[PDB]
Amino acid sequence: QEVNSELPPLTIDGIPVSVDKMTQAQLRAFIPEMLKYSTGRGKPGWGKESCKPIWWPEDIPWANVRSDVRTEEQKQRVSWTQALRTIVKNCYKQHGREDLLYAFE
Amino acid sequence: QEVNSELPPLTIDGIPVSVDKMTQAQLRAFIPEMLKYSTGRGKPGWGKESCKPIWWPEDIPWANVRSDVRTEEQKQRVSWTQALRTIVKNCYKQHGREDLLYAFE
DNA sequence: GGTGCGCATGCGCACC
DNA sequence: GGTGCGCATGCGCACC
């Protein structure tokens, strides 16, 4: 874990939302923003090993969330929505920002 | 004029900068963000008449600031940097956010 | 609502 | 520093 004061608050267009209530569409939009704030870089570097975050979930490929590239079997163990929530949850935890993650509870 | 509480503050990565001291590079980055906050839309709609802001400067084409498309003569009356500052200044004025524009003075 | 995908668009490289 | 430009990338359309 490595604290990052710079992760955004779990709000969309201002309204506070918990990660568990974000829609698939909202998550897909939130995740690149979280990555920009998380790394300071303007571009995620999707797919490049050198840019794979340490907290990236293991049963998801390091790939643009634009289009789910998981294996068909991977898609049965976990829904694409649950997978996108794991991406967010894993990023906030690894930065020790559980305060922000569980704020809406 | 139409007040917009939602225009960003004239800061880059946190540091406050006046529009007159922004570098060409910084301006090119700032302007699309200003447009997003200005309109609520995710995409500027560069070139489309239906999206041309009313405050757009007259001696600049409605075109991605990525690449200066002004006529060669237009480029002599006004430098590309001065042109990009006019874009910002005109947007903040038309939204009545002179408080933000002249903050650093 | 979920999700693939078309493509506009802005990050940052390249070169002066 | 200035600026053109290559192209990765995420907004939002399309369709279920």
Numbering used by the authors:
A (entry chain A), B (entry chain A): 179 to 283
Q: Which passages does the manuscript contain on this structure?
A:
Nuclear respiratory factor 1 (NRF1) regulates the expression of genes that are vital for mitochondrial biogenesis, respiration, and various other cellular processes. NRF1 was initially identified as a transcription activator of cytochrome c by binding to the cytochrome c promoter as a homodimer. Subsequently, a consensus sequence GCGCNTGCGC (N represents any nucleotide) was identified as the DNA binding motif of NRF1 (6), which has also been detected in the promoters of many other nuclear genes relevant to mitochondrial biogenesis and respiration, such as the promoters of reductase (ubiquinone-binding protein) complex (6), cytochrome oxidase assembly factor COX17 (7), myocyte enhancer factor 2A (MEF2A), and ferridoxin reductase (FDXR). Our structural, mutagenesis and luciferase reporter assay results revealed that, although the NRF1 DBD alone is capable of recognizing the TGCGC DNA motif, the cooperativity between DD and DBD is essential for the binding of the intact GCGCATGCGC sequence and the transcriptional activity of NRF1.
To investigate this, we expressed the NRF1 DBD fragment (aa 177–284) alone and assessed its binding affinity to the 14bp dsDNA that we used for crystallization. Our ITC data showed that the NRF1 DBD binds to this dsDNA with a Kd of ∼1.4 μM, albeit ∼5-fold weaker than the NRF1 dimer. Subsequently, we successfully determined one complex structure of the NRF1 DBD bound to a 16bp dsDNA with a sequence GGTGCGCATGCGCACC. This 16bp dsDNA exhibits a comparable binding affinity to the NRF1 DBD as the 14bp dsDNA. In the NRF1 DBD–16pb dsDNA complex, only one NRF1 DBD molecule and a single DNA strand are observed in an asymmetric unit (ASU), and the complementary DNA strand from another ASU binds to another NRF1 molecule. In addition to the interactions between the NRF1 molecule and the DNA in one ASU, its symmetry-related NRF1 molecule from the other ASU also contributes to the electrostatic and base interactions with the DNA duplex, which results in two NRF1 DBDs bound to a DNA duplex. Structural analysis shows that the residues R206, N242 and R244 from each DBD molecule interact specifically with one TGCGC motif, similar to what is observed in the NRF1 dimer-dsDNA complex structure. Mutations of any of these residues of DBD led to a significant reduction or complete loss of binding between NRF1 DBD and the 16bp dsDNA. However, in the NRF1 dimer-dsDNA complex, the DD restricts the orientation of the DBD, enabling the two DBDs to bind to the intact GCGCATGCGC motif from nearly the opposite sides of the DNA duplex in a head-to-head orientation.
